[PDB]
Design a binder for this molecule. Structure first.
Ligand SMILES: *[C@@H]1O[C@H](CO)[C@@H](O[C@@H]2O[C@H](CO)[C@@H](O[C@@H]3O[C@H](CO)[C@@H](O)[C@H](O)[C@@H]3O)[C@H](O)[C@H]2NC(C)=O)[C@H](O)[C@H]1NC(C)=O
Ligand SMILES: *[C@@H]1O[C@H](CO)[C@@H](O[C@@H]2O[C@H](CO)[C@@H](O)[C@H](O)[C@H]2NC(C)=O)[C@H](O)[C@H]1NC(C)=O
Ligand SMILES: *[C@@H]1O[C@H](CO)[C@@H](O[C@@H]2O[C@H](CO)[C@@H](O)[C@H](O)[C@H]2NC(C)=O)[C@H](O)[C@H]1NC(C)=O
Ligand SMILES: *[C@@H]1O[C@H](CO)[C@@H](O[C@@H]2O[C@H](CO)[C@@H](O)[C@H](O)[C@H]2NC(C)=O)[C@H](O)[C@H]1NC(C)=O
Ligand code: NAG
Ligand code: NAG
Ligand code: NAG
Lengths: 375, 352, 50
């Protein structure tokens, strides 16, 4: 039983679509499947997002997988709320309780603020990118007010690539006057690399320094540069490579034709792709649960247009959203459970350090228990 | 040019000072062109409702748009304005990243606030910021805090409760010197003032700053007795000749049918901006014509309106001494070369 | 040993400078003398700022 599906993918994201296709083949079955209609665009152009969302809505899509950026959150969430159309994302979780939006990415503030307390930090810088909102920045500042921390928050997201070299050096020159030996690099993979490649040049990767990479993908970057400098490097990873499902997936991943699955050959997998794969699993589980439960989901006719006065949402969307939120399965990221709001719960965020041998896990973190330490 | 130059309007409330000022200012329009208000009442926060209204105005063929936007729907709107090459006038909060088709009739206070804080020997202080687009001004401060080495303890009102204020002020008064900045909206400032009047507003070394472009509108009567310092900014001078005449004529007409808020003043000025641009366009004899195609905003691909570019330039070129100040526009599309009035309110004193 | 003389041709000087950096031995304490008649020939932009 084919169920129509929609897909949005940011321009220049090759690995994620490949993981989407791999998840399709893995979870596809004779009795059930998915028919995805794909669109590629610049997710930071709300106009393009609106056009794609409306086109897919006209194409009678029951749910829409996709990504979004800080300049397209509100458009997407409003459209989903008005049209009662679901949305499944591995992108940053909303700073709110927006409905009809399932979020596959776990929050990070809890683990970050626990880790900063497992190290007894009082005076640290906080380099942040102007993306995925400033929710974690605000959390850090608030906990500073409570705990009398000394935070130097600096933005690096408005730096021109052409003149990148001059600014970073002056930034660290400023930080040196305060003896800022501790830093939190709250940025995506690319800018973390572009910064680590300028800590090295100025020799600030040495015994004295400590870096915390506030990202759910720690290995994703290039850490072979700083393994040996002598400086600490801490971070978080949801994809545990010492697991069974993960190892089997890697067996299927490395043995992949990069001519067909770009990014697939490498042994590493980025958390966005992992969450995309788990998202395919989520959709299949929810839709198959609907089929078993006999819930009636079918578009008898045509959804005229996204823009229609008055807006007339089709009333089976609540069923789809409830099914998507009411699914409990294991996957690459770990255990996937949702709330009535869509945010994930009952998840474990493994913590990692950098050692000359390589990254090694030292503990984990769960919302219920605490920061937990094993090694 | 045709006198049926239809203009749009996006407003949140049918009856308000801003809407009334916009309606009134058109009466003074004696130019050959006739601008239609074509008001639509739309909820600002909801992006979908707004996209519906904006595409409806596209269907009508509107040449230019005036209205308001909030944090949630700034990006959406901005994006449509840079794609269809359609201009959008606004007195709402200005933004750092924007197209050239969005004319923001509200000068940014971030630069002046830094100067005022610098002048006073401010070593450490508390910052209070509303999430309603205030974040752009936060970063500036946090960026200047590092360069110039003062401490800033930010607290958000949107996600702060009465207990939050209580704890913040209790920890604050443990310090000998108490300095506070309050960036807020027009209406949030009144509620926060009420909150501080209850307690912690005694005036014992308390120095408040109000990052609001209009400081006369706010009812700081409760602050004229407790003996507390407050500094603020003003953009509109009522005494000057042009403001005095405008206020006299407008208030006389309205009564024949109080002091306007800064938002209402900017709303009134925007009418003058649009009228000046269209008058200069008619004078310059520029070929403006609206095709009746009225293509759906969601047209793939959406061809830019050919004339819409020049309109922008015209709207950018205009310049005149308006009510608030001298109106001008930068290349980015933002108020430039303006003046602000620093104003301290003593127990009995309004000192410029 | 904070002082070193790299008496080698361009290629091996690069292959060594690209391993002083990795281990963070291009810092205030160290001194290097590149015993070669071509000093610029290599890539010194790596260690200008260490
Ligand atoms: C303009 O935008 C939207 C829709 O017009 C409005 O936001 C919506 O406001 C309603 C009522 O406050 C919210 O419903 C309530 O939400 C709270 C959570 O905030 C929940 O606890 C309640 O049970 C109830 O569901 C709704 O969630 C909210 N939607 C969004 C997307 O924010 C907004 O108030 C409108 N403004 C005006 C002036 O009409
Ligand atoms: C880099 O990592 C090492 C190992 O975790 C840190 O060294 C420890 O720090 C404690 C903190 O007081 C000191 O007593 C010892 O030097 C080490 N003890 C233990 C149990 O590891 C080092 O401090 C880290 N660098 C920074 C800048 O935090
Ligand atoms: C910046 O604004 C001031 C307004 O105070 C402009 O000064 C006026 O400029 C016009 C145009 O040259 C003159 O006709 C007026 O006599 C000036 N008045 C005053 C009080 O200076 C100034 O020209 C503007 N700057 C620029 C570059 O446009
Ligand atoms: C690196 O270069 C600097 C500058 O040449 C050296 O610093 C000088 O070394 C002398 C030697 O005793 C000291 O008195 C001072 O620190 C500096 N003086 C002068 C005149 O430059 C530094 O020693 C060099 N590093 C090494 C390892 O030799
Ligand atoms: C929820 O978390 C537990 C650990 O707290 C783990 O066994 C698994 O992820 C989930 N188990 C449940 C929900 O029983
Ligand atoms: C408050 O105002 C007084 C003048 O009334 C002046 O000393 C200074 O501006 C402020 N002094 C404080 C807050 O101690
Ligand atoms: C307003 O302008 C008059 C002169 O035009 C001046 O005397 C007065 O100080 C101004 N008011 C403010 C608040 O700047």
């Amino acid at each position: 039983n084919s169920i129509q599906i929609g897909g949005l993918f940011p321009r220049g994201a090759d690995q994620e679509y490949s993981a989407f296709r791999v998840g399709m083949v893995q979870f596809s079955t004779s009795e059930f499947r998915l028919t995805p209609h794909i669109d590629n665009l610049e997710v930071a152009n709300s106009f393009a997002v609106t056009n794609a969302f409306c086109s897919q809505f006209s194409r009678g899509v029951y749910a829409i997988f996709g990504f979004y950026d800080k300049k397209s959150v509100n458009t997407i969430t409003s459209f989903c709320g008005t049209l009662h159309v679901s949305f499944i994302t591995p992108s940053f979780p909303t700073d709110g309780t927006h409905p009809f939006v399932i979020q596959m990415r776990p929050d990070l503030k809890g683990a970050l603020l626990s880790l900063i307390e497992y190290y007894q930090w009082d005076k640290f810088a906080y380099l942040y990118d102007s993306d995925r909102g400033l929710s974690t920045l605000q959390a850090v500042l608030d906990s500073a007010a409570e705990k009398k921390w000394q935070v130097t928050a600096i933005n690096v997201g408005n730096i021109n690539n052409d003149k990148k070299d001059e600014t970073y050096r002056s930034l660290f020159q400023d930080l040196e006057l305060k003896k800022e030996r501790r830093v939190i690099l709250d940025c995506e993979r690319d800018k973390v690399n572009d910064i680590v490649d300028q800590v090295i040049t100025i020799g600030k990767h040495v015994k004295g320094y400590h870096y915390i990479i506030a990202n759910l993908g720690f290995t994703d970057g290039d850490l072979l540069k700083i393994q040996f400098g002598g400086a600490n490097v801490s971070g978080f990873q949801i994809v545990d490579y010492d697991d069974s499902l993960v190892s089997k997936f890697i067996e299927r991943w490395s043995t992949l034709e990069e001519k067909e699955y770009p990014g697939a050959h490498t042994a590493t997998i980025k958390y966005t792709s992992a969450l995309t794969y788990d998202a395919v699993q989520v959709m299949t589980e929810a839709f198959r649960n609907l089929r078993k439960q006999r819930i009636e989901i079918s578009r008898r006719g045509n959804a005229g247009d996204c823009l229609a006065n008055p807006a007339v949402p089709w009333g089976q969307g609540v069923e789809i959203e409830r099914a998507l939120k009411q699914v409990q399965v294991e996957g690459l990221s770990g255990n996937i459970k949702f709330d009535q709001n869509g945010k994930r719960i009952n998840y474990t965020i493994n913590i990692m350090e950098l050692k000359t041998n390589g990254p090694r896990k030292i503990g984990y973190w769960s919302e219920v228990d605490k920061m937990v330490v094993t090694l | 040019f045709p006198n049926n130059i239809q203009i749009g309007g996006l407003f949140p409330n049918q009856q308000s000072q801003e809407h009334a000022a916009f309606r009134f200012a058109l009466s003074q329009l004696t130019e050959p062109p006739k601008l239609l208000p074509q008001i639509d009442i739309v909820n600002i926060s909801d992006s979908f409702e707004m996209t519906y209204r904006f595409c409806s105005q596209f269907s009508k063929g509107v040449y230019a748009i005036f209205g308001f936007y909030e944090r949630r729907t700034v990006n959406m709107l901005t994006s449509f304005c840079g794609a269809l090459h359609v201009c959008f006038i606004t007195p709402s909060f200005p933004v750092d990243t924007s197209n050239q088709f969005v004319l923001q009739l509200r000068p940014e206070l971030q630069e002046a606030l830094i100067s005022i804080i610098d002048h006073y020997k401010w070593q450490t202080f508390v910052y209070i910021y509303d999430a309603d687009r205030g974040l752009s001004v936060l970063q500036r401060v946090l960026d200047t805090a590092a360069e110039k080495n003062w401490q800033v303890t930010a607290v958000n009102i949107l996600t702060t409760t009465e207990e939050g204020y209580r704890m913040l002020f209790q920890d604050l008064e443990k310090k000998k010197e108490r300095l506070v900045v309050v960036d807020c909206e027009s209406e949030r400032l009144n509620a926060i003032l009420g909150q501080i009047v209850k307690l912690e507003k005694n005036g014992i070394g308390y120095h408040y700053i109000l990052a609001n472009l209009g400081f006369m509108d706010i009812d700081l009567n409760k602050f004229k007795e407790s003996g507390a310092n407050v500094t603020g900014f003003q953009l509109v001078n009522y005494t000057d000749t042009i403001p005095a005449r405008i206020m006299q004529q407008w208030r006389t007409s309205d009564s024949r049918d109080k002091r306007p808020k800064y938002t209402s003043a900017l709303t009134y000025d925007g009418v003058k901006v649009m009228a000046e641009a269209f008058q200069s366009l008619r004078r310059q004899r520029i070929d403006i014509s609206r095709r009746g195609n009225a293509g759906d905003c969601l047209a793939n691909p959406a061809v830019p309106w050919g004339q819409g570019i020049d309109i922008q330039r015209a709207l950018q070129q205009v310049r005149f001494e308006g009510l608030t100040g001298n109106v001008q526009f930068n290349e980015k599309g933002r108020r430039t070369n303006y003046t602000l009035h620093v104003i301290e309110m003593k127990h009995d004193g309004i000192r410029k």
